[PDB]
Ligand binder design. Sequence first.
Ligand SMILES: [Sr+2]
Ligand SMILES: [Zn+2]
Length: 476
Amino acid sequence: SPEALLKQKLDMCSKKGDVLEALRLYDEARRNGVQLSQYHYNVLLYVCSLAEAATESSPNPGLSRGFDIFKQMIVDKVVPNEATFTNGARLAVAKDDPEMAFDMVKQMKAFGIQPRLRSYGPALFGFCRKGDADKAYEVDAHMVESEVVPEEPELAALLKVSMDTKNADKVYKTLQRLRDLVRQVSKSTFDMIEEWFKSEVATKTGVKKWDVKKIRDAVVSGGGGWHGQGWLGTGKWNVKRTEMDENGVCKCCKEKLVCIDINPVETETFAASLTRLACEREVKANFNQFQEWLERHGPFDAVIDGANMGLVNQRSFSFFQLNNTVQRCQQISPSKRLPLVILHKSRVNGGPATYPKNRALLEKWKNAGALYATPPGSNDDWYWLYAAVSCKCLLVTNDEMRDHLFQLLGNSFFPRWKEKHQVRISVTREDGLKLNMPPPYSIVIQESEDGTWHVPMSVEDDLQTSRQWLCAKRSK
Ligand SMILES: [Sr+2]
Ligand SMILES: [Zn+2]
């Protein structure tokens, strides 16, 4: 069967990386009238991605024809799927022709296809490296129009190209986008922002006077922690690497950062998403059974990830560390409620239950309405997440929350929720166990009412490493 032959012949052609033979074979199928399928086209895109940019000659048939093949797939109304976009992008990156990468995205749009974020990169990054800001901004506007959300690398590129071309309005706008979508910035981006604020263009932008009432109302309107009305003040910036104290007071300038509210309506949307996601991956009846039990229990001030409390920094499950975490949560509860312990039934009945008094305590917590033993096969994470979200209470876990599951939750709401709800434990020799509570301010880029900026660097563990901030305040 001829399509099936081609499939095999291209699967074969090539794990060998034979582009010249993939291209001969492409042509042959078309001289034979064999209709190329989704799979055929993808293998062909991949294989052309193996080719390379000819520094010493006019470009090679492989990369060159790759775009031709991509163009042709879309003409043929073969639907792209995730591998199509990835291979399409690799091809774009290898060629390193931004204008040509942009064409692909334009063709996609023309034919009612949604480009992905990775489709835009080779275009955006190409123009930014070459210093072409106007093209970068076109790509940016196209991505906005298609509702494709940039991440930090795309914003950082846009920020640098705006700095390189002296465009203070675009720097401002991109800085706002970093605040809104990223919150805390990588070392890269942090250094770039510091350079911005020390730069001639920053020194020379600003206004000596402005409508305070208008800034005031913008702060209300924005949700807090920024205003978005432009650069304020004039003259040289005083730019310092610094730290916030535990109350969110900048140690450089003494400004007290804001604690930015979460709108309860976003919370109810996220709860609904959480239930839907969990019911897609859990056995639906298991998750529903927990939902129904939770409705009949509580109230709760805290939810514990019992597997994480038993295991974090331990060589095996420590009933001591779980139990001491339960007790400490109960002690900080104003009315001394026990926390809700989420734990696998295998643990309730196995590894932390070979000492009879510990088994009896686990059963006591259950009998107190303060323990739910999840069934075998379940991923506990959906359970303690849903419980903390639905009870609107503290969540006690040191889980990094970088598993694939957690990426399904998004990079706007969930990280803001996490900051306000997550309690983590730390242990010292001198003191034993401590609960580290949510900060009383928001760890995010902030712009004050007089135009002072505070920019937080992202870190792996802000209890392990002390978080550096930038303080940018006009010397005036
Ligand atoms: Sr877990
Ligand atoms: Zn400051």
